[PDB]
Amino acid sequence: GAMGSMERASLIQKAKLAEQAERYEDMAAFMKGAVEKGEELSCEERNLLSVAYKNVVGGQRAAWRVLSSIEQKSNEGPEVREYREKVETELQGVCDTVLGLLDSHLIKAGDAESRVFYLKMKGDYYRYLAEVATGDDKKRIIDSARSAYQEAMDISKKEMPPTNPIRLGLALNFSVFHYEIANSPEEAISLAKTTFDEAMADLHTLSEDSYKDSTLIMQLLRDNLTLWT
Amino acid sequence: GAMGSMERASLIQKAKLAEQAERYEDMAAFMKGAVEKGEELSCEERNLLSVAYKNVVGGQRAAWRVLSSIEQKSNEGPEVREYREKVETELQGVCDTVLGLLDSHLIKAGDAESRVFYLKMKGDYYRYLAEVATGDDKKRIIDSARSAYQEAMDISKKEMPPTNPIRLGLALNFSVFHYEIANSPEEAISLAKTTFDEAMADLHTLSEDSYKDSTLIMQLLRDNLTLWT
Amino acid sequence: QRSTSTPNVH
Amino acid sequence: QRSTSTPNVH
Ligand SMILES: *CC(=O)NCC1CCN(S(=O)(=O)c2ccc(Cl)c(F)c2)CC1
Ligand SMILES: *CC(=O)NCC1CCN(S(=O)(=O)c2ccc(Cl)c(F)c2)CC1
Ligand SMILES: [Cl-]
Ligand SMILES: [Cl-]
Ligand SMILES: [Cl-]
Ligand SMILES: [Cl-]
Ligand SMILES: [Mg+2]
Ligand SMILES: [Mg+2]
Ligand SMILES: [Mg+2]
Ligand SMILES: [Mg+2]
Ligand SMILES: [Mg+2]
Ligand SMILES: [Mg+2]
Ligand SMILES: [Mg+2]
Ligand SMILES: [Mg+2]
C-alpha cells in the first residue's frame, strides 16, 4: 500500500493533522494505512477512521443527490446520467474500501464497544450502497445492512447501558435504515421511540467522558420522531 | 487527455453540473478539457474555469496555512513538515496546471476583457506559488506575478472603464500582491485607494449586467484599506 | 427533508 | 487577519 513504509504512529499523527486541515481524503488514507498495520484501534483512532470516511462519503452522497435530482427533473442528452454514474461509481468504490477494511482487518473477539461499532459501520456503508443500488444487487445489499445492524443491536443490548453513545448512534442509524431504505416507518418509529424512552429511563448511566454525545443522539432520535409523526 | 473523447459542449454542461454538485475538482477537469479543444472561452465559460480552479486551489491554500502554522508553533518529529510538503506539492501542481493552460491555450489577440482576465489569472496563480516559495525560485515567481499583473493593468486602464469588474478585481488582487507578497504596503494602499476613488468618480460607467460584481469589489477595496490603515 | 443519522464529532 | 482578494461569484 501507499502507506506501507510509514510508521503506524506517524500515520495516526498525520490523520490528526489532516483532520485539522480538513483534508478528509488524506485523513481517510492515513487511517486506512494505520488499520492495515493489523493492530486494533483505540476509541480515539476509531473516531478518526469514522470521521474521515464519513466526510469523504458524505460529500459523495450529497453530490449524488444533487445530480440524481437534476436527472429526475429532466425526465418530465446523456450528460446528467453519465456524470451521476461517475459520482455513483466513486461512492461505491469508497464504500467497498471501507467494507473491505472492516471484513479484512477490523471485525473480530475484542471490546463489546469495538465489535458493536464496527458492525454499525458495516451497516452504515451497506446502507450508503443501498441508497444508489438497483435490481438483483439492491436486495443483496439491504439484507447485508440489516444483518450487520441486527447483530450490532443484539450485542449492544446485552453488553452496553442504554445511554452508551455507540448503542444510541447504532439505534439511530438502524431506524433511519428502516425508514429510508427498508420502507418500514412503523419499525423505524418503534425503534426510535423505545431507544429514546429506555435512555431516559436509565438516564443515570450517562458517562462523564461521553454524556454530551449521548444527549446529542437522544435529541436526534426525538427530531426523527417529530419528523415521522 | 482524459477528456479528449468528450464533446466540448458536453464538457461545459458537465462543468455546470459539477458546480451545482460542489465537485470542484471534477469541474476543473471538465473545464481543462474544454480549454484543450482550442477554441476561445466566452465570459460565462471563463467564469466556470475561474470558479473551479480557485475553489480547488483555495482549499489547498487553506490546508497549507493550517499545517504551516502548526509547523511554526512546533519550532519554539518530521510528520508535520512532511505532510505540509505533501500539500505544498499538490498546490504547486495545480498552479502549474493552470499556468500551463494559460500559456498553452488561453493568453493570446482577442477581447481586451479576455486578455486582461487571463493575465490577471496568471498573476494570481504565480502569487499562489509565491505564497509557498523560497530561495532562488521565490524571486523568479514574484517577478513573474508582477509582470503579468502589470501588463493586465496597462491594458485595463487603456481599454476598460474604471468600474469594469475585471479591471477592479485585477486591481484588488494586484494590491494584495503588493501588500502580502512584495511587502510594499504603500504601493498596495495607493493602488487600492486610486482604484476605489476612480471607480466612484466614474460611477456612471457601471454596467447593467455586472454592477453587483463591481460594487462588491469596491467594498473589498475599502475593507482592505481599513485593514491597512 | 430526510431523516437525521449519527453526525461527526470530535 | 489577511487581505481580501477577489472572491468567487456566479
Ligand atoms: C470508544 C469508541 O469506540 N469511540 C469511537 C466512536 C464511537 C461512537 N461512534 S458513532 O458513530 O456511534 C457516534 C458518533 C457521534 C456521536 Cl455524537 C455519537 F453519539 C456516536 C463514533 C466512533
Ligand atoms: C466576461 C468575463 O470575462 N467573465 C469572466 C469573469 C470576469 C471577472 N473575473 S474576476 O476574477 O476578475 C472577478 C470575480 C468576482 C467578482 Cl465579484 C469580480 F468583480 C471579478 C471572474 C471571471
Ligand atoms: Cl462524466
Ligand atoms: Cl442477544
Ligand atoms: Cl505525508
Ligand atoms: Cl498603456
Ligand atoms: Mg508501524
Ligand atoms: Mg423536458
Ligand atoms: Mg448504477
Ligand atoms: Mg484486548
Ligand atoms: Mg468538441
Ligand atoms: Mg516544543
Ligand atoms: Mg518546499
Ligand atoms: Mg473574435
Q: Which residues in D1-10 are b (16+ Cβ under 10 Å) and which e?
A: eebbbbeeee
Beta-carbon-side half-sphere exposure of residue B21 (alpha carbons within 13 Å): 32
Q: What letters, b where the CB count within 10 A reaches 16 and e where it falls short, cover A186-221?
A: eebbebbbebbebbeeeeeebeeebeebbbbbbebb
Sequential DSSP letters for A79-108: HHHHHHHHHHHHHHHHHHHHHHHIIIII--
- The region that residue B8 occupies, defined by phi over 0 for left and psi between -120 and 50 for alpha, beta otherwise, is alpha
Using CA atoms, how far apart are residues A150 and A145, in angstroms rounded to an integer? 9
Judged on CB neighbours under 10 Å (0-12, 13-18, 19+), B177 is buried
CA-proximal residue: ligand 1, atom 9 (nearest): A166
CB contact under 8 A, A172 and C7: no
Distance CA B172, CA B221 (A): 6
Q: What is the dihedral of CA B170, B176, B181, B185, to 10 degrees?
A: 120
Question: What resolution in angstroms does the PDB record give?
Answer: 2.0
Contact between chains at B213 and D9 (C-beta distance less than 8 A): yes
Counting beta carbons within 10 angstroms of the beta carbon of residue B56, is it exposed (0 to 12), middle (13 to 18) or buried (19 or more)?
A: buried
Asked if B5 reaches chain A (Cβ–Cβ under 8 Å), the answer is: no
- Using CA atoms, how far residue A185 sits from A23, A180, A218, B2, in Å, is 36, 8, 18, 45
Residue A30: strand, helix, or coil: helix
What's the sign of the alpha-carbon dihedral A163, A50, A186, A215? Answer: positive
Q: Flag whether residue A211 sits within 8 Å of chain C, measured between CB atoms.
A: no
* Helix/strand/coil for A134: coil
Query: Which protein residue's CA is at the shortest distance from atom 4 of ligand 2?
Result: B43
What is the A97 CA–ligand 10 centroid distance (Å)? 25
User: What are the start-end ranges of the E strands in chain A?
Assistant: none
- Alpha carbon of B81 to ligand 5 centroid (Å): 8
Chain D residues inside the 8 Å CB shell of B54: 8
CA atoms within 13 A on the CB side of B98: 29
Interface check for A67 against chain B (CB to CB < 8 A): the answer is: yes
Cell of D5: 482578494
Cα atoms in the Cβ-side hemisphere of radius 13 Å centred on A144: 17
Q: Shortest Cα distance from A51 to chain C (angstroms)?
A: 6
Q: How many residues does chain A have?
A: 229
Long-range contacts: A75-83, Cβ < 8 Å, 24+?
A77/B10, A77/B13, A79/B10, A79/B13, A79/B14, A79/B17, A80/B17, A82/B14, A83/B14, A83/B17, A83/B18, A83/B26
CATH class of A8-228: mainly alpha
All cell numbers assigned to A19:
483532520
Atom 21 in ligand 1: which residue has the minimum CA distance? A47
* Cα–Cα distance, C10 to A47 (Å, whole number): 7
* C chain contacts of residue A179, beta-carbon cutoff 8 Å: 3
Considering only CB atoms, A83 lies closest to which of B17, B62, B67, namely B17
The DSSP string of chain B is: -TTTTS-HHHHHHHHHHHHHTT-HHHHHHHHHHHHTT-PPPPHHHHHHHHHHHHHHHHHHHHHHHHHHHHHHHT----HHHHHHHHHHHHHHHHHHHHHHHIIIII-----HHHHHHHHHHHHHHHHHHHHT--HHHHHHHHHHHHHHHHHHHHHHHHHS-TT-HHHHHHHHHHHHIIIIIS--HHHHHHHHHHHHHHHHHTGGG--TTTHHHHHHHHHHHHHHHHHH-
**Distance of CA B19 from the midpoint of ligand 9 (Å):** 22
DSSP-assigned letter for residue A41: P
A171: enclosing H helix or E strand: helix A165-176
Q: Which three cell numbers stand for residue B94?
A: 495545480
**Searching chain D, which residue's CA lies closest to the CA of residue B120?**
D6
Q: Output the nine-digit C-alpha cell for A183.
A: 420502507
Residues A99, A78: Cα–Cα separation, whole Å:
31
